[PDB]
């Protein structure tokens, strides 16, 4: 558990319907939500593969007369043993796989957060609830750049310095 979901981010966004993870930005031209396309797509592909693997990894009934009770009981034992083994396998598989999926989503959110942090460096201040306030006024182009992964630190460094 990476402590991002139900962790630093105390809750989800019901106003965000286009993806699992993403951003909410407030600027002078307006606020809005926008899912992070790369991470959401990668997560969807990984989960699709996970679900397909479980499905893709994966004639009975005999009759005996009154003098073959032993073979009937042997057949019953075979059927019951296979049934119990398969029930146990399915239950354990689901139980562990659900945790791996939830931890994977937590890791995705956490990694998105640290990627934005490492991009911004000291040009932004961590509010602490999960957000960043920019020391420098920067418009929708700035937000699109930081979302994409091509934020230009030296461009805004001087302007952010005297506001810090």
């Amino acid at each position: 558990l990476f402590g991002a979901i139900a962790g630093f981010i105390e809750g989800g966004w019901t106003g965000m319907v286009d993806g699992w993870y993403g951003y909410h930005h407030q600027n002078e031209q307006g606020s809005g939500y926008a899912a992070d396309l790369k991470s959401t797509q990668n997560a969807i592909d990984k989960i699709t593969n996970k679900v397909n693997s479980v499905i893709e990894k994966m004639a009975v009934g005999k009759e005996f007369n009154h003098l073959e009770k032993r073979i009937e009981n042997l057949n019953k034992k075979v059927d019951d043993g296979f049934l119990d083994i398969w029930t146990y396998n399915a239950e354990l598989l689901v139980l562990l796989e659900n945790e791996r999926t939830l931890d994977y989503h937590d890791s995705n959110v956490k990694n998105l957060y640290e990627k934005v942090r490492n991009q911004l460096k000291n040009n932004a201040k961590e509010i602490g609830n999960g957000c960043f306030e920019f020391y420098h006024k920067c418009d929708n182009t700035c937000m699109e750049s930081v979302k994409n992964g091509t934020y230009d630190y030296p461009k805004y460094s001087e302007e952010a310095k005297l506001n810090r």
Partner: antibody, heavy 120, light 109 residues
Framework: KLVESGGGLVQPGGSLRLSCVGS????????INWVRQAPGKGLEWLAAISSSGGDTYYAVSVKGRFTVSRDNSQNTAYLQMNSLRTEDTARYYC???????????????????WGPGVEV | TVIQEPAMSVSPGGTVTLTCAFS?????????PSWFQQTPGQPPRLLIYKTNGRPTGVPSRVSGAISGNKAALTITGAQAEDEADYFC??????????FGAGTPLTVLG
């Protein structure tokens, strides 16, 4: 495929229920969108419902007057219109993203499978 | 609101681009443009989803991209079966899908 039903004549102020039934694409894991096209006018998105029916999204011009429901066991999606006006004369379509098994169904999923549509 | 071209015409064998934009704003990849083709009296057919998606059964001639603050649909080498009404669907925020007016494409010849 997607087959629609309902539709016909209605007085201004009446109600009508439309149904959309699908087969072969995992109806329980897809968003269902209801769209309209007025005769001689462009398409107009009307409503959308999630896979479990918890999330329902309407347009501003049809909010309150339209209600959307889903029955996954019968593989049906229902649109009920009350307080029908004169401007609501159009051909109605049900659309969805038809996939074998959707791990994640989102509101912005593409509208691939369209029904023939009904008339109102 | 969504703004499209009132009408455009193309010659056979040539390339044609169709633009879809906002009345006030910029169209980006986060707005998920979707292009629909409707022949009269038929349900619409999806051509492009998410500005580059090509569903199975759609020729590689039809392609999409983002140019400036607009979403662009390019059809290269138009035939006579590429005469229909083209619609643009754009997602704004808080679950609002808006369709365009529709641009009737008239292939000359």
């Amino acid at each position: 495929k997607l087959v629609e039903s309902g539709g016909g004549l209605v007085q201004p102020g009446g109600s009508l229920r439309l149904s959309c039934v699908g087969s072969g694409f995992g109806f329980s894991y897809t968003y269902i969108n209801w769209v309209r096209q007025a005769p001689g006018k462009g398409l107009e998105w009307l409503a959308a419902i999630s896979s479990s029916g918890g999330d329902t999204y309407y347009a501003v011009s049809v909010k309150g007057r339209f209600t959307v429901s889903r029955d996954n066991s019968q593989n049906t999606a229902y649109l009920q219109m009350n307080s029908l006006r004169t401007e609501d004369t159009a051909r109605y379509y049900c659309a969805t993203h038809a996939v074998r098994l959707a791990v994640a169904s989102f509101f912005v999923d593409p509208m691939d499978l369209w029904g023939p549509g009904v008339e109102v | 609101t969504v703004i499209q071209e009132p009408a455009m015409s193309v010659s056979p064998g040539g390339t044609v681009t169709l633009t879809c934009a906002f009345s006030s704003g910029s169209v980006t990849t986060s707005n998920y443009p979707s292009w629909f083709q409707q022949t009269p009296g038929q349900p619409p057919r999806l051509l492009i989803y998410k500005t580059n998606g090509r569903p199975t059964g759609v020729p590689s001639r039809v392609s999409g991209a983002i140019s400036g603050n607009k979403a662009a649909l390019t059809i290269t080498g138009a035939q006579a079966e590429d005469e229909a009404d083209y619609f643009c669907a754009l997602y704004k925020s808080i679950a609002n899908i808006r369709f365009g007016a529709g641009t009737p494409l008239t292939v000359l010849g």
